[PDB]
Amino acid sequence: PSREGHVADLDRFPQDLRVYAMKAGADRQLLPFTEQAAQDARWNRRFFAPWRMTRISVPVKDVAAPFGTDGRPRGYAENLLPWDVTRWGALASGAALDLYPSQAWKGIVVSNSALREVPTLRPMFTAPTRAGQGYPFDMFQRTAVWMGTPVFVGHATADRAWLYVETAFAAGWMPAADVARVDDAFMTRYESGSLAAILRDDTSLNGADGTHLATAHIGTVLPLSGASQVGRTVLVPVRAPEGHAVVVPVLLTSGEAAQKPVPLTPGNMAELGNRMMGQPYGWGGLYEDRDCSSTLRDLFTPFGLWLPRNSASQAKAGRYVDIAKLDADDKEARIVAEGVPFMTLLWLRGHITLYLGLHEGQAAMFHNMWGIRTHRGGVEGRYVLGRAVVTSTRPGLDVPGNDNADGLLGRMQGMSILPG
Amino acid sequence: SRPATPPVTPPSREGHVADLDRFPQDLRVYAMKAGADRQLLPFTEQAAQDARWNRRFFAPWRMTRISVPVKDVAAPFGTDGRPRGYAENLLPWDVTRWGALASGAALDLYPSQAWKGIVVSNSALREVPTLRPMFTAPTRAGQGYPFDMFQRTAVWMGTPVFVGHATADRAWLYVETAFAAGWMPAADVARVDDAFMTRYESGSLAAILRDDTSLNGADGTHLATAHIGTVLPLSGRTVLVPVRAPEGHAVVVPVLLTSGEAAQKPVPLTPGNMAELGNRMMGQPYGWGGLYEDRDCSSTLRDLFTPFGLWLPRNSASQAKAGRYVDIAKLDADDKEARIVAEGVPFMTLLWLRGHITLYLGLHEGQAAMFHNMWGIRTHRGGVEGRYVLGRAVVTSTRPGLDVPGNDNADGLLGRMQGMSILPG
Ligand SMILES: [Cl-]
Ligand SMILES: [Cl-]
Ligand SMILES: [Cl-]
Ligand SMILES: [Cl-]
Ligand SMILES: [Cl-]
Ligand SMILES: [Cl-]
Ligand SMILES: [Cl-]
Ligand SMILES: [Cl-]
Ligand SMILES: [Cl-]
């Protein structure tokens, strides 16, 4: 194309979910109230499940695996050189895996954080000089975790600076200072009453005294303790100096928070999704950005439809339609014939998208992606879009060197019609 | 008078150069030659230096308003406010999101705050209020990752700040430390009152002596992690750790440390004491502006000298002018080396070129040796700049990487050196 990060689809398809929602019926209920209520109840059971565990579920073999084959260093660090043998060894020794699991207690994430493959915020890149394998693909980033997320704590490093914890959707190493310990009193009170869904990214949570507590993004849920015509008060978990959780009430606007679940309509979905439009891609939520699957999970959270964290798992949600063996144009035709706008996920290995309906005769999809795989002059590349966009099923059609003769469409295996 | 055959074979492994075999990566070797237990300054002079270190460190708590004028706060938001460079997706910064940073910064109200704080966890001063990066040219040598140009400097926990502004949403503060100012996440700062500051500045300070020193309460609660360059009040060695309460003010939690982890400041200035601390840094990866809580050339030297109470400013060029400066810029390379050998004071002399600064350690096999954390050797292949990356704290000659292919320059870092600075000033 002409300029960086552009393809013709971004002019053909409006980067505005409202256009597709108008066509779908902006105020149409995509699920009946009772069924959406059931879905929301399930969402809450999944979210708080770590608080009912009595031990961590991850076997030590899986905890040990990322420390390397015979513990040897993996890949490249932040200096674009192979990970230092001594510093790598020190990560493993401090992990104290001979004692795993050494902890069994319940907590809550008090600030946006991450689950890491090993207990460091320093990165690992498999191959800095190869397209798709250098920065920003920090392979130690398993997933971002939003503030307010219940965790079960199963292990700590010897120095106590890192914990190995389990959320409803993933497990990994997390900085200890991002977790507050919760007791029965706290948990009971926290789960009683209604919850609110955060409706805008980068929503600052400040106490009535002006103290800044944390920032919340779409996908975040907090207890709702009051609501007026334009205001909503939420309870924000905060870590006290002694390590336990307290709650601080925070006043937000009705533009920033609503009682969960928000009604599931294309118009309501478009309003939330448009807030993500153009957001940079972050592998496993690096930089508090989003990737293909965290985009979809966070988009559906305010409506109470639970999705797992990874793309391949999300594809197994709802009602599957296999399309793997079809010719590319037959695949697009089947998506068009059977896909349910705003409620269907389109899946290929390593990528997942939301189907929005037909736009000017082509299937349209919302997704946050990295790049189109290319080869030019005999060298592998990526044509990077790197952000949340609306495209066709073949966004890379115009890109020179596109490795997929039939694009992403050609690689698609199935559609997943929500909910299950 | 035949010039040297240019090197064409790369060193046997990535990140390696011949100097790393010629020079022991172990500061004790150079310390033992210098006199490991020999005191490098008279006591009273070191005491005066340490008193100055403390004066400077606590200066923000003596301010009544922030000293940074609004024009300096506004400038990094771009020429006519237009986006700068590339973001974490390696594409030009988004116009809308860029504008949102400026409009949320509420510069029309600057300075909106006037209060004193302390940094409770290792943090950073940023050019603009985001932890997302800016790269000037992702595809170009020295201009892509990991050179996040929004990273002004790391700030270690326990640092006094004066708070002069906040974003409209209160999530970011504009603050001034003793050595730098910039945007910092609000939750990394706890508010301090007169009573706190008085108790806090009273009594003795301890210097942390080991990187990655985990600070945990007696109850087992993890508080934060402290590195070399960190100083905290002394109550083994019980340090008073500042912690942010839910109401935003600082409290202190005592943390019991070993004599290996903390000592009363200042530690006596000897080559052996410097060698022990610097050996803790050896091999540590390079991070521009302290990215990842790593160190760069100048934060390396500042943090190394902190336990001894020798204040260094944050920027390399400023550190060069902190000591007695000897200009060597007009000398040819061999005469420069001879001058460093003749006038340089081992373990007390900084060697400066534009964009890099090192510590002179004395002579090793007839060559000036130096300790430094560097990124790369400048190379060129087919017209295009490259870098042969060492990217970590090393000991080398003044001309490391003459064995690197594509390094056409005969004179190395030495050739670019402008002067030496003999501490203390
Ligand atoms: Cl409608
Ligand atoms: Cl790439
Ligand atoms: Cl899940
Ligand atoms: Cl249409
Ligand atoms: Cl494509
Ligand atoms: Cl001695
Ligand atoms: Cl570079
Ligand atoms: Cl300074
Ligand atoms: Cl160089």
CA distance A123 to A139: 7
Which residue, B367, B359, B378, B362, is CA-closest to B295?
B359
Residue-range domain boundaries for chain A: 8-25+266-418, 32-260
Contact of B387 with chain A, judged by CB distance below 8 Å, is answered with no
Contact B391, B319 (CB under 8 A): no
Best probe of the A interface among B14, B90, B101, by most A CBs < 10 A, is: B90
The helix (run of H) or strand (run of E) holding residue A1 is none
Measure CA A387 to chain center.
14
Q: First vs last Cα of chain A: how many Å apart?
A: 40
DSSP-assigned states of every residue in A194-238:
-EEEE-STTEEEE-TTS-EEEEE-TT-EEEEEEE-SSEEEEEEEE
Pull the structure tokens for residue B281.
Answer: 């840094």
Contact B205, B54 (CB under 8 A): yes
Residue of B nearest to A242 (CA): B221
Q: Name every residue whose Cβ is closer than 8 Å to that of residue A377 and which is 6 or more positions away in sequence.
A: none
Residue A399 Cα to ligand 5 middle (Å) = 8
Contact B2, B239 (CB under 8 A): no
CA distance A317 to A420: 6
Q: Do B91 and A386 touch (CB under 8 A)?
A: yes
Contact B279, B230 (CB under 8 A): no
Residue B387 Cα to ligand 7 middle (Å) = 5
Task: Point out which residues pair with A155 in neighbouring strands.
Answer: A164
Residue B33, Cβ neighbours under 10 Å: how many? 15
Query: Rg of chain A's alpha carbons, rounded to an integer?
Result: 22
The helix (run of H) or strand (run of E) holding residue A172 is strand A171-175
Q: Name every residue whose Cβ is closer than 8 Å to that of residue B255 and which is 6 or more positions away in sequence.
A: B215, B216, B217, B218, B223, B238, B239, B240, B241
Residue A419, Cβ neighbours under 10 Å: how many? 22
Pull the structure tokens for residue A200.
Answer: 């805008």
Interface of A with B in 11-30 (CB under 8 A): none
Measured in degrees and rounded to the nearest 5, phi and psi for residue B340 equal: -60, -40
Contact of B292 with chain A, judged by CB distance below 8 Å, is answered with yes
Contact of A384 with chain B, judged by CB distance below 8 Å, is answered with yes
CA distance A152 to A108: 8
Interface of B with A in 310-349 (CB under 8 A): none
Contact of B143 with chain A, judged by CB distance below 8 Å, is answered with no
Residue A409: HSE in the Cβ half-sphere, 13 Å Cα cutoff: 25
Contact A270, A30 (CB under 8 A): no
Q: Do A81 and B187 touch (CB under 8 A)?
A: no
| Ligand number nearest to the C-alpha of B314 | 8
Residue A405, Cβ neighbours under 10 Å: how many? 7
Residue B186 Cα to ligand 7 middle (Å) = 32
Tell me whether the omega of the peptide bond preceding residue A419 falls within 30 degrees of 0, making it cis: yes
Q: Do B247 and A82 touch (CB under 8 A)?
A: no
CA distance A217 to A145: 11
Contact B227, B280 (CB under 8 A): no
Contact of A254 with chain B, judged by CB distance below 8 Å, is answered with no
Query: Rg of chain B's alpha carbons, rounded to an integer?
Result: 22
Measure CA A35 to chain center.
24
CA distances from B252 to B52, B211, B212, B232, B243 (A): 25, 21, 20, 11, 6
Task: Point out which residues pair with B325 in neighbouring strands.
Answer: B421
CA distance A268 to A258: 12
Pull the structure tokens for residue A81.
Answer: 């050189």
Q: What does the angle CA A136 – CA A137 – CA A143 come to, to the nearest 5 degrees? A: 110
Pull the structure tokens for residue B5.
Answer: 């055959």
Alpha-helix runs per DSSP H in B143-296: 194-201, 271-281
CATH architecture of A8-25+266-418: Alpha-Beta Complex (3.90)
Q: First vs last Cα of chain B: how many Å apart?
A: 42
Measure CA B195 to chain center.
31
Task: Point out which residues pair with B94 in neighbouring strands.
Answer: none
Q: Which long-range contacts (CB under 8 A, 24 or more apart) does A67-71 make?
A: A67/A91, A67/A92, A67/A95, A67/A97, A67/A118, A68/A92
Pull the structure tokens for residue B383.
Answer: 């017209």
What residues of chain A lie within 8 A of the CB of B170, using their CB?
A: 204, 206, 210, 212
Which residue, B304, B311, B314, is CA-closest to B176?
B314
Alpha-helix runs per DSSP H in B58-151: 70-74, 95-104
How many angstroms is the resolution?
Answer: 1.8
3-state DSSP: chain B helix, strand, coil percent, rounded to 5? 25, 30, 40
Contact B249, B191 (CB under 8 A): yes
Calculate how close chain B gets to A206, using CA atoms only, in Å.
7
Which residue, A307, A325, A327, is CA-closest to A317?
A307
Residue entry with tokens 């230092």: A84
Q: Where are the beta strands (DSSP E) in B142-257?
A: 151-155, 160-166, 172-176, 181-185, 189-191, 205-208, 213-216, 222-226, 231-233, 237-244, 250-257
Contact of B254 with chain A, judged by CB distance below 8 Å, is answered with no
Length of chain B: 425
Contact B309, B424 (CB under 8 A): no
Full 3-state SS string of A34-92? HHHHHHHHHHHHHHCHHHHCCCCCCCHHHHHHHHCHHHCCCCECCCCCECCHHHHHHHH
Residue entry with tokens 């955060």: A198
Contact B388, B398 (CB under 8 A): no
The helix (run of H) or strand (run of E) holding residue A188 is helix A184-191
Tell me, what DSSP letter sits at residue B6? P
Give the closest of B132, B216, B245 to A241, CB-based: B245
Burial annotation B362-396 (CB, 10 A radius, 16+ → b, else e): bbbeebbbbbbbbbbbbbeeeeeebbbbbbbbbbb
Measure CA B420 to chain center.
19
Residue entry with tokens 């790393």: B20
Please tell me whether residue B338 adopts helix, strand or coil conformation: helix
For the sheet containing B417-422, what is the strand order?
Answer: B324-327, B417-422, B349-353, B356-364, B367-381, B384-396
Residue of A nearest to B148 (CA): A78
Contact A278, A264 (CB under 8 A): no
Q: Where are the beta strands (DSSP E) in B265-397?
A: 324-327, 349-353, 356-364, 367-381, 384-396
Q: Which CATH superfamily is domain B18-35+271-423 in?
A: endopeptidase domain like (from Nostoc punctiforme) (3.90.1720.10)
Measure CA B310 to chain center.
14
Tell me, what DSSP letter sits at residue A324? T
Residue A137, Cβ neighbours under 10 Å: how many? 18
CA distance B46 to B345: 16
Q: What determination technique applies here? A: X-ray
CA distance A166 to A159: 20
Q: What does the angle CA B189 – CA B153 – CA A163 come to, to the nearest 5 degrees? A: 60
Residue A133 Cα to ligand 2 middle (Å) = 6
